């Protein structure tokens, strides 16, 4: 008995984390900001506003010593620049330490892929430098490293530090027809059973987080959940196993924006009227031993309520949204038998399909305008409970061998 | 309450084996929905159960077989060109891999297939096939239309499942062959 | 004869498209741009 095959909803894998628009933000620590601009000029600025204004500038290839008017932090400034490379773009880091302070150029980096990377760590700003295909990194010590913003005026990505092995190669290279009898005649009769049943089951969810800063998730999906227990019926102790799965779920997604600090749920599934919940039940009882060749199946099962649990999203900053509310009542949508035939043995399953009907209260997510939706979330379907239960009658009509027969 | 009653008397049954030559045919379906906005963001490009009916001569017997093809265990991929309204985005599409399988449900009308109930055991020996991926354009209001190309997956025989839905008097049967996948060149 | 329940999934009502970031582009005809500022000053600019 037991294991069916109804799995789904797997996902792999954001590699660049998506293009982010030109904005001013404060990326985290131990994470590399990767710049791959499309037009020359200013690319990124870093400002602490008391003693540190850094500005990285991209000079086109085959540009000689000349002065240009670049708007650095909202004000025009005459910056002198030169590049000996006829084909390779040149990154220069113009820095000052006062509001009216002097601009001083550091670097350069002559690189064909037009890729640059920066990060903050332990009181310094590390950046890429050197030459291709022999690129390396350098650093500049800076006080108050943890409060400096990094404002980009061009598209960029964010890559974790632990994937430095991928960051380096990124910077380097970029992205007849007959009937045969087998046995003689046999002897079987029909036996009708009436028993009682108490199916105990539980939900399980699969939580896969999107790689990046930590503000956005990738997948919060359902997953089949198994359960074992031991219960009494008419004085006999039976050790019953259950396995709950689902189908026909509806995929909701939230997007606060493309900024790396905006909360995004690329997908999370919910059960509604257009869904079902299957409960595969099996035990080692003698009734189930006999129940192989079955003619009819019926059962008078009661209804069960299932509520949504609270899920706290661990954001770096801000008040954590909490998905709360939601609940659905169930009713047995008949029971199906399945028989999977393997090379050497056969496997069975008795799946009680349960249809769904929404009830009160609705679920919501505070501080977020997407509110007052229906359904039971996949974030925490168990609502902190160890199991749900549905109990009732079981009425079976099966085909079994016969004894004390052949006459009246 | 626990009791044991009888509904019918004794009877006689015979364990009889049937070997038949089967030629299954099937097809796939696509359900491509365009999301709100300009027309550069797609919400879903996903499979759909593909029903197909056909008639074929099996050892001179005309047999009308009805099949329904689907895939299970697939993985969810996506693509992004940017959050700008003119950038090509596909939020979630599905793709079959080695971790997945292909389930072809079916039934037909010949006596041998009308008699496959109370099966004790069974097995099928088939060969492998190939399914390649075709072309499809993405209609954009303004700009060259992206088009897809490449990809191919070979199927190899697997087990069978016989599903019987009972609602309280009746039997509702269907057969279902399974196929394991090996992704084969060309890529997509 | 009837097939069993096949595995499926359906998206439903992604009505709120966006939010997008400040940027420049040529919006197409037959499409309302609905702007929602948060501070005073300029909101949208346009030039031929």
Please characterize this protein's 3D structure.
This is part of a larger assembly, with three copies of chain A. By secondary structure, chain A is mainly beta. Helix content of chain A is 4%, strand content 56%. Chain A has two helices and 32 strands. The first copy, chain A, has helices at 164-173, 286-290; strands spanning 10-11, 31-35, 41-47, 53-59, 63-72, 75-83, 89-96, 104-111, 116-121, 124-131, 134-141, 149-152, 156-160, 178-185, 189-201, 204-208, 216-217, 219-223, 225-233, 236-247, 249-255, 264-271, 276-283, 294-301, 305-307, 311-312, 322-325, 327-341, 346-358, 363-365, 376-377, 388-400. In chain A, the strands form seven sheets. In chain A, strands 2, 3, 4, 7, 8, 9, 10, 11, 12 and 13 form a ten-stranded mixed beta sheet that branches. Chain A is elongated and about 115 Å long. Chain A starts with 9 loop residues before the first strand and ends in an 8-residue tail after the last strand. At the A-C interface, β21 of A face β1 of C. β21 (249-255) of chain A pairs parallel with β1 of chain C, so a sheet runs across the interface.
